[PDB]
């Protein structure tokens, strides 16, 4: 109902923000920043929030709000919310000033919230002697934003190249940092807010707060529950429960297993899982997943292909990563189409089910036809695990890694066959079972084997992957402990015919990926 | 003389070592012409597989297995820090049934040993299971009962665990009680350096010395007591062969003029003609034999640059690890029989800088085996950017010393942000065929790694080596 327009400028912090919007009950509404006002004019927009970046905001092809576009949330009075460089673009839209600081900010950082009173509190004021000499070249006041604070000193995020050296407009300097002198401004006239730090990371002890008042206090929001949307929109399924088909294709993750046990509920005999074996999965994965459906779902359809083949030969000779991925999901598509013919109902009386999630809209707005059904357009990662566990579904589900669709392809280096695959396979199923045995995996992320085309002294070259994710775009490597990694690593290269040598990666999410092509 | 035979163990040089501590002249060979040599006794060695022998029983030559050793003397005759047993009810685990079907001693070996228990390090998948011929049970562990044996007829010796290594206490004990009470051995190897210098002095008059400069210990230590006796006459040459890391020919070049001021020292700027001839060149082997004919050319043109052959003599850094694995001008090596260990001891003899004593080996192919495939100018910008700062990291952290070996790898691989994945790697040698990664704390890894990652372009992926030797090498080529 009341709506917050969220901007995108790149952050990798991007589904934070939002998630943060889901957290408290208000609907999120993503677009990029080059949204046009046609776009917008006709939505309940309550208030605009834009978004950190990767950008310098003084340089050319940098990102910006278009005239009209800013220009329309001033007159229609229209609050907005400004991080990093959200902020900054605020700052440079109106006759501000932005530059590259002597010293960048990240990690951790305390900063103090400004006020006439206040002003005494700030000791560092020599980086920019007395305190009462500095602010006297800014206006200050004696902020709704940090409304219910308590504190006058806040521990926030960091990650910025770029501050504002000169205020915009008739701003009131409101937040002060021992690296960032005008670290927040507020405009009482036009509503608009900019901090500097991050407010969506979890990092950031008040951000819940800034994020409420913005919303409740300062847009004058009304309403929209997240982990209730899915139950509305099962509620309303129910009437298409005995002329309707529903098809899902199955892949053993968290996903689309908690959607389907929702959705099998209620079209019983009439819901169809497939399960397609891509011949890119783990050591027994095939086997194993197909097993677990059943032995979870006993009177569900489920319909299993070996495509194995299918997927292998076309796979012949690729190197390139977006081949690969191309390719695949060319070919299940090809072989999903023909399982769903294959059971032989009416394709105009039939409803795909995914598993989709919030991240994967956001995403999606960026840069046989069923009628589709996505219970969980709004949810997240712990929304999903939270509902398998009201499922009484096993731990197994809940905590098992996720796995990409392109499975092994993207994690054979090179040139993929089935003497690699093998040899992947055993690699990675030591580690996944070793992780287990001490106990590692349930507080990893995401954790696998990779396989090189590059050779030591000659046989292959293996890699292992593990980290801790805190969303889509940001992760940490994790940190085993090397008592157990040794025992691992002694392991696989006495284990395994074939590989001479184990690497483990160190990199983190930026710059580096999760996963290596 | 003491023979050993290799029988493939990662511990040959440890035994070689142990040899050289208790001052016994050793003759490394394989597993034929030895009846020529002065042998007093022969040790046979460990292997991870798990013949003269008649001529050593009948010529009354001692054996002295270990490991394999032990195994292959008990069929010829028909893992970790454990403490074993040489008095048999202090066996405690097994009571005295057990030690009843075997024959026990009332040993030569274990003499002047005190204890009556010893720490010794294991590494074994095999073990004997039943005795040979007429030999004595002489101890036991908790793991094996047939631990270690003894025949008197022969002097016949064998222990399951290694003495060689520096874990097993009383390892020097046992081979020196092998080597003088049991061979009855009546050369020092420190000293074999110092005699072979006075009398190359006798030609400092008529004849000149050459020797190769890399800037590693070896080569330094040589040229700095060979220059002090021939002075002029001595000609030291140093090739930059452009595989070596970021202004190493310079820093080198430098240190040696402001180390031995009097030394007569030419720089040859060689990496155009290295890089062209290496240009496609990807197999492993291919790249170290170009090198070294390439570097062989190179060198003896620069010696035909500067004023008798038939008097010059070529001095060597060759060590006794050098020699062991084998196994114009006139070639001196007064290293031959020694140790890094010991090469170290005499860098500080002579007031060496601390820099020299302690570098990590630097190889002769230099960079060219830690780029994987193809290399050129691109790829060993980057390797050498990723080196520098991995390096001075771990001398800054302190970390530096206590390392073996540390440096960077860049890979033929490459990872998407598409750029190039480099590879962190850094050891704890114990010796030529045995080391273990080193494991660096992790908030000091994730410090280097997050400079290379911010500060080098072209690589926006970094791994590190967890992979020890053996079954892993200490360099990826
Ligand atoms: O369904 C998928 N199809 C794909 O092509 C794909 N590529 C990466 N991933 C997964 O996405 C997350 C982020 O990985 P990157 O940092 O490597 O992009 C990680 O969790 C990856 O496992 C994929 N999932
Ligand atoms: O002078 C050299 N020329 C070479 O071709 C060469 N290959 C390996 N090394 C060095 O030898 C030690 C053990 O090497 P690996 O464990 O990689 O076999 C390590 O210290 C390596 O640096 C070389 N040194
Ligand atoms: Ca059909």
Redesign the pocket.
């Known amino acids: 109902y009341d709506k917050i327009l969220v901007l995108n400028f790149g952050s990798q912090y991007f589904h934070l923000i939002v998630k943060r919007l889901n957290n408290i009950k208000i609907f999120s509404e993503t677009k990029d920043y080059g949204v046009e006002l046609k776009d917008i004019k006709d939505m309940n927009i309550k208030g605009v929030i834009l978004s950190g970046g990767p950008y310098s905001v003084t340089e050319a092809g940098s990102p910006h709000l278009k005239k009209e576009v800013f220009e329309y949330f001033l007159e229609k009075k229209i609050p907005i919310f400004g991080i990093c460089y959200g902020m900054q673009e605020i700052a440079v839209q109106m006759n501000g000033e932005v530059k590259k600081s002597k010293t960048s900010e990240y990690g951790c950082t305390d900063v103090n919230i400004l006020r006439n009173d206040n002003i005494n509190n700030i000791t560092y004021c020599r980086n920019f002697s007395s305190a009462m000499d500095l602010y006297s070249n800014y206006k200050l006041m004696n902020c709704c934003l940090f409304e219910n604070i308590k504190s006058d000193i806040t521990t926030v995020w960091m990650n910025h190249n770029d501050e504002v050296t000169k205020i915009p407009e008739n701003f009131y300097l409101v937040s002060s940092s021992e690296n960032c002198l005008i670290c927040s401004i507020y405009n009482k006239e036009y509503n608009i807010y900019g901090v500097q730090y991050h407010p969506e990371v979890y990092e950031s002890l008040d951000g819940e707060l800034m994020f409420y008042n913005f919303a409740y206090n300062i847009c004058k929001c009304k309403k929209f529950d997240p982990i209730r949307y899915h139950e509305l929109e099962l509620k309303n399924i129910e009437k298409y429960k005995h002329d309707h088909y529903v098809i899902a294709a199955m892949s053993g993750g968290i996903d689309s297993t908690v959607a389907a046990a929702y959705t099998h509920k209620i079209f019983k005999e009439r819901f169809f899982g497939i399960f397609i074996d891509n011949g890119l999965l783990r050591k027994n994965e095939a086997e194993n997943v197909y097993t677990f459906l059943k032995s979870t779902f006993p009177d569900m359809n489920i319909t299993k292909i070996d495509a194995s083949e299918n997927f292998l030969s076309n796979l012949q000779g690729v190197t390139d990563p977006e081949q690969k991925?191309k390719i695949?999901?060319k070919l299940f598509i090809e072989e999903f189409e023909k399982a769903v013919n294959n059971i032989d109902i009416d394709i105009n009386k039939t409803f795909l089910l995914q598993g989709t999630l919030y991240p994967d809209i956001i995403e999606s707005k960026c840069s046989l036809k069923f009628k589709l059904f996505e219970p969980f357009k709004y949810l997240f990662k712990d929304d999903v695990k939270t509902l398998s566990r009201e499922l009484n579904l096993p731990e197994e589900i809940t905590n098992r890694?996720?796995?990409?669709?392109?499975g092994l392809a993207?994690r054979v280096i090179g040139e993929i066959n089935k003497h690699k695959l093998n040899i992947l396979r055993e690699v990675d199923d030591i580690f996944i079972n070793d992780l287990k045995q001490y106990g590692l995996y349930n507080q990893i992320?995401?954790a696998?084997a990779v396989l090189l085309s590059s050779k030591s002294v000659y046989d292959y070259v293996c890699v292992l992957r593990a980290?801790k994710?805190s969303s889509?775009?940001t992760?940490n490597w994790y940190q085993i402990p090397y008592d157990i990694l040794d025992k691992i690593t002694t392991r696989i290269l006495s284990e395994v015919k074939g590989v001479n040598r184990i690497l483990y990666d160190v990199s983190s999410?930026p710059p580096?990926?999760?996963?290596?092509?």
């Open positions: 991925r695949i999901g890694h996720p796995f990409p669709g392109p993207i992320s995401q696998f980290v994710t889509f775009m992760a999410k580096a990926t999760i996963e290596f092509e």
